[PDB]
Design a protein around this ligand. Structure first.
Ligand SMILES: Cc1cn([C@H]2C[C@H](O)[C@@H](COP(=O)(O)O)O2)c(=O)[nH]c1=O
Ligand SMILES: Cc1cn([C@H]2C[C@H](O)[C@@H](COP(=O)(O)O)O2)c(=O)[nH]c1=O
Ligand SMILES: [Mg+2]
Ligand SMILES: [Mg+2]
Lengths: 208, 208
């Protein structure tokens, strides 16, 4: 079973992955996790991150260039994902293809039924062959609270300063809205919308 | 020995590679060739090409995004290049790293000592580990004649319509000028500047 955890920056995805993995293991299932972007393991992922921190000329100014880099990062992980799915009972991803649809549409002020989301579908699932997730869990949180978490992280960790997307409050708001639409539309597969107070044990039961 | 053939679009590079390969083989040396972008064998190369033909939103509008895609294409060929160099006496490339420096600098109206060329050096040779060529042969041709060849190709081949770069006469002119500077500076290694009437036999002897 392939599960992807989605949501805006600072929504609490990393923590939910930890809790969810614990719940599944407590139920006797083997779990493997992977986070995108694969910082350090992908040139594409690293250049993308660096561009969001002000490097690489005009790269970050292109919405499709950024989307392509994140897609190329995942392209390099296709075999790894397939291998994990046949080796473990559950594979949980901290961000996946939907992140590209949500952020790209939001940067272009488009909705889930727009051009960018359709492009992501065509490129990542059909062309690159990335498997569609069995479940996509949207950790919905107020744009205000998520932004507060991102700012707090930068304050206590010099290695986690905010990037261009995180500094854009309006973009984060629009991204959250597109995510809600993607979930309602069942984009890329079935979705579940949860809040910060979701119970890991029952969520795992729902996904199982 | 690693040799890269450089020059603007329609300069006659593909033909020179054929003639040069023949000369080396006539001298008893084993030869292997590779052309960049690796159309069909690289997602990065294909998306780059498609962007130059009007697809993928705002991707082509970013100079660094295009450069990154061509660099990622080469990154996926590092092992292939190293393998060919230890398996054959001579390895000839139809375009290599210098193409990225020349075209990127030209799109930004910069010279060979500018920011873009320096970025290509840092990213491709140092960071990606691409081997520096023993020789880089600049097939210098009048911008007018090269443009005529590109237009003629599109006229007789529906599968070879010109792309955004080829349709930009001024860009082609500036690229030729940056190439001349790169050669004079010995950027990335030693260069040889030749014309359309260069003798394949003697050129091969010079490179040998
Ligand atoms: C994985 C992924 C992330 N992003 C984003 C959202 C984040 O603001 C930024 C880096 O992700 P991160 O916050 O998970 O480290 O890039 C995309 O736009 N597309 C993608 O496919
Ligand atoms: C290989 C390569 C090509 N290019 C260009 C020059 C050509 O106009 C275009 C496609 O190359 P081609 O003419 O050899 O098919 O992309 C770069 O800008 N950087 C590179 O690294
Ligand atoms: Mg982030
Ligand atoms: Mg061309």
């Amino acid at each position: 079973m392939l599960i992807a955890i989605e949501g805006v920056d600072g929504a609490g995805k990393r923590t939910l992955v930890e809790k969810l993995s614990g719940a599944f293991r407590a139920a006797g299932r083997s779990v493997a996790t992977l986070a995108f972007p694969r910082y350090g393991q992908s040139v594409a992922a690293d250049i993308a991150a660096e561009a969001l921190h002000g490097e690489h000329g005009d790269l970050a100014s292109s919405v499709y260039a950024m989307a392509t880099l994140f897609a190329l990062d995942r392209a390099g992980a296709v075999h790894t994902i397939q291998g994990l799915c046949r080796g473990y009972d559950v594979v949980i991803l901290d961000r996946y293809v939907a992140s590209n649809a949500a952020y790209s549409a939001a940067r272009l002020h488009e909705n889930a039924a727009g051009k960018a989301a359709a492009w992501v579908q065509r490129i990542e699932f059909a062309r690159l062959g990335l498997p569609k997730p069995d479940w996509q869990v949207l950790l919905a949180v107020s744009a205000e609270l998520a932004g507060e978490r991102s700012r707090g992280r930068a304050q206590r960790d010099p290695g986690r300063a905010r990037d261009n997307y995180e500094r854009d409050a309006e973009l984060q708001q629009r991204t959250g809205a597109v995510y809600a639409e993607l979930a309602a539309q069942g984009w890329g597969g079935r979705w579940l919308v949860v809040g910060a107070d979701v119970d890991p044990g029952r969520l795992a039961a729902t996904l199982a």
